[PDB]
Subunit: 192 residues, 2 copies
């Protein structure tokens, strides 16, 4: 496959280029290696595409990651426990006489404190990846930068209706105003 567009959010790409140059080179090579034709089961299959990326990513040591945390109804306690370890979060919340509720986020591809999301899903999933998933791993000190691989409109239009595309998601990010979300990111738009 090929990269058509790349957007560096909060200079996330440059951070990778300085501190983890091998990662940027690898991400680029993995994309080139994906055979989109074999996924043309003539629309393209999101399941087939996800399987192809999964094999290549895991073949290069990108592995699953999970981050646990405790939520609560109290805004003050949330702000005071965001950066704490799970057990400490619960301890602090309960010590204030408030209820702690178990939660977590899980992602398939993490390596060298970089998370990569390959998204060929419906319109609501990218928003969730950017503002909740990547942010969760970032705030929990598991990643320093997140990467979102998305199909350009030229590819999404050749897939089932309802699949989000690069141009639309880039818009959703920039529409937030400067520097939102707080996690540095690299948005990559691809095509066959």
């Amino acid at each position: 496959m090929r990269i058509v567009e790349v957007y560096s959010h909060l200079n996330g790409l440059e951070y990778i280029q300085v501190h983890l140059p091998h990662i940027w080179e690898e991400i680029q090579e993995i994309i080139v290696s994906i055979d989109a034709e074999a996924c043309r089961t003539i629309l393209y299959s999101p399941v087939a595409l996800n399987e192809a990326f999964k094999e290549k990513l895991e073949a290069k040591g990108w592995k699953e990651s999970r981050t646990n945390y405790y939520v609560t109804a109290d805004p003050k306690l949330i702000r005071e426990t965001l950066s704490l370890e799970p057990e400490e979060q619960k301890k602090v919340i309960e010590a204030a006489g408030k209820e702690a509720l178990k939660s977590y986020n899980q992602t398939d591809f993490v390596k060298d404190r970089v998370a990569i999301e390959v998204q060929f899903g419906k319109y609501s999933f990218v928003a969730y990846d950017l503002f909740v998933k990547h942010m969760a791993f970032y705030v929990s000190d598991k990643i320093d930068v997140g990467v979102e691989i998305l199909p350009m409109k030229e590819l999404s239009k050749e897939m089932s209706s309802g699949i989000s595309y690069y141009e639309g998601e880039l818009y959703n990010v920039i529409r937030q105003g400067r520097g939102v979300p707080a996690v540095p990111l690299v948005l990559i738009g691809i095509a066959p």
Copy 2:
């Protein structure tokens, strides 16, 4: 039904109380009027709950709204056209030699420049409502404040697994850091 928790984001609630006091009173009355028991088709049905709120909301003049816009791959052009009318966005993007792509957002309940989302859906939909939907209507100058009505965990646990709850979504918002999203909001957690 009853309100258990209320969170004013960027002082959104106070904005309503000063400029639109009748709206806050009405929202509170609508919630009280909802018969959660009749939706206990003993778990609670999200479809039944959504139908009950829809009838009460529309009965009070809350109506659908749609906002159109043109996205593009060019970050600079996006920032320069965010606040423009749709036709002007396309004109500006194309005048720079870049492609404009049609898009939009639609919501069921808008009145007096306030949007209300009643969410009893899966984990990814609230994120989309907050960071994309409410923000789209806000940036397009259709609303000044957004409202998100969510079930507290005590209610969501009595519904199908996978339904987001107040405590979890409040966490997702505060985890962003101060003032994100840029649109003022009122988060309301409810129970039977």
